[PDB]
Design a protein around this ligand. Structure first.
Ligand SMILES: [Ir+3]
Ligand SMILES: [Ir+3]
Ligand SMILES: [Ir+3]
Ligand SMILES: [Ir+3]
Ligand SMILES: [Ir+3]
Ligand SMILES: [Ir+3]
Ligand SMILES: [Ir+3]
Ligand SMILES: [Ir+3]
Lengths: 122, 122, 122, 122
């Protein structure tokens, strides 16, 4: 799945996820969000299961973006957790957690949850 | 917070999180889970906000572990999203998503959610 | 939105959600899951915002099903949290948490997270 | 567990959860949040597993509050999903999803996630 995961992906929001999957389970690349307090590309790093089940199961993976780059700092980090499904309609189906830096008093409202589906076309 | 984050952390489950925070926002290290289909150390990578608010707010961060190493492959990945709070009782407060590789039919039950609190003592 | 919410809804899994919205914010009805350790109808109850923003915003709502009925007991409960969006393509977009009863030792793996989209056709 | 669940509970935020558990699996009561856009009591309804495992497992349950009452309308709903654990240090351990009513453009940031632990003392 190293071959299947590596490349450019697009989600339902119009965001662009560019990733290289290493032979070892490494994920590295950049993320550009179509929404939120974000501009241009942000570094991402993550991990994937580099020897997944050969019984038609998806390939577990995850990655993180910290929303600081040379343009902006949104004092937040998003992690996507999900699975890569290969084939003619390849998809990475994820759920994500976005945590903002907050005061201790506001910690209860620090974390957003959502889901993104990434495809090779878009 | 590069200085504050780098080091060994322990969660409420007895798991051990060893991390180095780079000047740039990189997180690298190893994770050893006290629970689940896990044995020994697993590679982790993530990101943190390397220029956080100076108004007492936490420092947003996240990381991923893919549960494959030389001992075991649990066909899953966990991402922790949260914030580092410094001081005498330093803490990393997180929520996490664990996605297992599944068939498409079982995708609805692919993802666990929980929360971990990490401290320097434990 | 009392009028818009009340009725039969179907999700992407083929599950059937039958609900009555009270003038007061009450939700009552039955849920039939197409998947999992479930058979036939289960009681549901919840709440909705009965005076939502008139600026095109969705209507916040939530409900719970405990997976015990006369046929089966799956020792679990699911809560859906989301919003109702009216119009020709009316939708209830949700994220859900399914907690199973567990021993204290297994509590870390007690809770599934996912998302369901409900429509009037299906 | 009907007997164990019924009563007044307090979370780590100082919020007050007053509930009656019906013989049938019904949960009814009021919630008063110590934090957020909330004042006084709000109606809650939910469900619990009224015949849980007798192997030391927790009792699955969930409930919803819509954040509208005679004082305020926060255009949001929270659902708590978790388990009741009985005994001398009885606890209801939950994870929750708070969805706000939003425009379709802002739906990606509509939902907060967190966790609450409720005890009989506090
Ligand atoms: Ir395998
Ligand atoms: Ir969605
Ligand atoms: Ir700042
Ligand atoms: Ir917990
Ligand atoms: Ir309003
Ligand atoms: Ir999905
Ligand atoms: Ir049982
Ligand atoms: Ir917390």
């Amino acid at each position: 799945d190293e071959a299947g995961i590596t490349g450019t992906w697009y989600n339902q929001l119009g965001s662009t996820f560019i990733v290289t999957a290493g032979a070892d389970g490494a994920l590295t690349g950049t993320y550009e969000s179509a929404v939120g307090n974000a501009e241009s590309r942000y570094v991402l790093t993550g991990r994937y299961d580099s020897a997944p089940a050969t019984d038609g199961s998806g390939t577990a993976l995850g990655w993180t973006v910290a929303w600081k780059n040379n343009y902006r700092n949104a004092h937040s980090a998003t992690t996507w957790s999900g699975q890569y499904v290969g084939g003619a309609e390849a998809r990475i189906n994820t759920q994500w957690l976005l945590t903002a830096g907050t005061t201790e008093a506001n910690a209860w409202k620090s974390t957003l949850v959502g889901h993104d589906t990434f495809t090779k076309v878009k």
